[PDB]
Amino acid sequence: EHVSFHVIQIFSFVNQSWARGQGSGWLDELQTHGWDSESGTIIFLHNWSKGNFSNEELSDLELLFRFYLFGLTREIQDHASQDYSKYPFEVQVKAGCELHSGKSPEGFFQVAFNGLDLLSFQNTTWVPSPGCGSLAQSVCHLLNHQYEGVTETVYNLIRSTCPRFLLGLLDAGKMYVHRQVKPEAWLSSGPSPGPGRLQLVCHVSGFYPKPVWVMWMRGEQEQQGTQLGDILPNANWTWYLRATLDVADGEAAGLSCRVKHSSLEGQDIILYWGPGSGGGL
Amino acid sequence: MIQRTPKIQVYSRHPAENGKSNFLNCYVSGFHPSDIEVDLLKNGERIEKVEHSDLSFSKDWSFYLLYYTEFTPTEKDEYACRVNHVTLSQPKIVKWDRD
Numbered sequence: 001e002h003v004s005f006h007v008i009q010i011f012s013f014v015n016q017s018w019a020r021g022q023g024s025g026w027l028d029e030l031q032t033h034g035w036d037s038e039s040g041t042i043i044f045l046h047n048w049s050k051g052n053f054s055n056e057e058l059s060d061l062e063l064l065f066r067f068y069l070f071g072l073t074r075e076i077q078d079h080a081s082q083d084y085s086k087y088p089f090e091v092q093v094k095a096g097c098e099l100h101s102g103k104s105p106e107g108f109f110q111v112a113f114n115g116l117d118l119l120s121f122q123n124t125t126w127v128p129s130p131g132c133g134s135l136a137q138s139v140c141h142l143l144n145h146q147y148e149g150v151t152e153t154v155y156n157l158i159r160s161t162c163p164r165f166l167l168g169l170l171d172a173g174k175m176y177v178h179r180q181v182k183p184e185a186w187l188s189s190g191p192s193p194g195p196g197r198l199q200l201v202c203h204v205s206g207f208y209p210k211p212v213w214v215m216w217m218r219g220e221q222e223q224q225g226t227q228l229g230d231i232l233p234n235a236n237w238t239w240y241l242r243a244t245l246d247v248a249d250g251e252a253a254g255l256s257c258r259v260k261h262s263s264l265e266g267q268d269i270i271l272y273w274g275p276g277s278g279g280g281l
Numbered sequence: 282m283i284q285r286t287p288k289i290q291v292y293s294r295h296p297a298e299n300g301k302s303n304f305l306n307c308y309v310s311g312f313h314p315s316d317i318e319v320d321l322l323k324n325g326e327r328i329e330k331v332e333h334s335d336l337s338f339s340k341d342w343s344f345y346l347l348y349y350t351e352f353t354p355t356e357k358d359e360y361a362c363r364v365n366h367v368t369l370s371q372p373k374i375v376k377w378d379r380d
């Protein structure tokens with residue numbers, strides 16, 4: 001399959017002397033790292049968040065980040081201070097690596113400006129996004145022909161340090177990343193869709209890992225009209241999900257929510273509706 | 282310059298049982314730029330000591346994040362999430378409705 005590590009940076013430039021930097025490290029969609037802007041240090045969120053890396057080499061990484069954040073910010077401020085009507089504006093960066101079975105690791109470094117793609121690091125070249133403006137061509141030119149210390153560092157971080165770190169991180173967090181957390185489920189009666197209609201609701205909460213299957217059922221017959229919400233986070237590193245169905249007042253009887261999740265070991269949660277107001281007795 | 286309005290979803294970690302402690306969540310997502318004001322209200326007054334996850338963004342570069350708190354529902358306590366953002370002419374309130 002596919003596995004990745006990445007850093008995100010969020011730079012908000014409010015005026016020529018006020019900007020804000022934040023960022024964070026991620027194992028696919030699991031956050032593993034914070035950044036303390038105040039002190040310029042890495043916040044290690046889990047007890048395995050150092051991977052197999054020595055404190056020295058993490059401390060070297062943290063200093064290389066401090067220099068970068070201050071330097072990138074100051075260079076942006078130098079350009080943009082020549083026109084104060086450009087403010088406010090936002091730059092986002094996503095940088096890291098991705099491994100595919102049997103391949104060399106692939107590195108990425110992608111930049112957005114005010115919520116659209118601006119430019120990206122493609123092998124050893126910085127390349128303006130399709131529909132390249134003036135801005136994006138100017139920056140790539142500056143990066144390709146006069147910040148060569150920069151490009152080499154970047155290259156080596158995403159192509160060699162990141163994969164190495166990534167694999168240490170997965171090794172040390174093996175237990176935690178593959179753990180299983182069983183969900184609970186419950187029903188409720190959501191808002192009336194119309195005259196003699198009911199909205200049936202099935203909540204599923206506290207599940208990990210993320211993949212999950214929820215349908216309304218009549219016996220073996222999946223109910224076509226089932227609507228899956230988005231899978232939303234809880235604050236204890238689990239997930240949440242509602243599944244709804246619009247039914248005739250009087251067709252609800254016999255219907256059930258069914259949940260399959262990898263933590264349940266084939267023993268699906270099945271909740272039958274009704275006959276009380278909100279799917280209870 | 283692109284701007285995107287936040288989506289706002291409010292929900293509890295557990296089914297609400299009056300007098301049982303629980304977690305109220307307000308997930309704000311799909312927004313741009315990142316500057317945003319989020320509050321949890323209890324009867325229309327803001328709760329202090331609200332925690333939130335570190336700011337992040339999706340593949341389309343829009344931002345998201347989770348605001349949450351310990352709380353204890355009762356029959357006649359109303360809880361909501363109030364959001365302010367430059368795309369919104371006025372703050373937007375979404376009510377926790379247990380359903």
Ligand SMILES: CCCCCCCCCCCCCCCCCC(=O)O
Nearest residue numbers: 007024025033042068095157162165
């Ligand atoms: C905030 C995250 C801390 C976690 C440390 C993990 C170390 C692995 C390195 C990953 C490479 C990310 C690319 C960062 C881009 C900054 C470029 C530069 O420093 O000049």
Ligand SMILES: CCCCCCCCCCCC(=O)O
Nearest residue numbers: 067068071072075076079139
């Ligand atoms: C100087 C070392 C710190 C990192 C420098 C990155 C420079 C990025 C170029 C800024 C582009 C621009 O503002 O037009």
Ligand SMILES: CCCCCCCCCCCC(=O)O
Nearest residue numbers: 076079080086089091111139
């Ligand atoms: C290491 C490469 C980082 C590239 C960042 C490019 C930032 C572009 C900023 C544009 C500033 C402006 O609005 O004038």
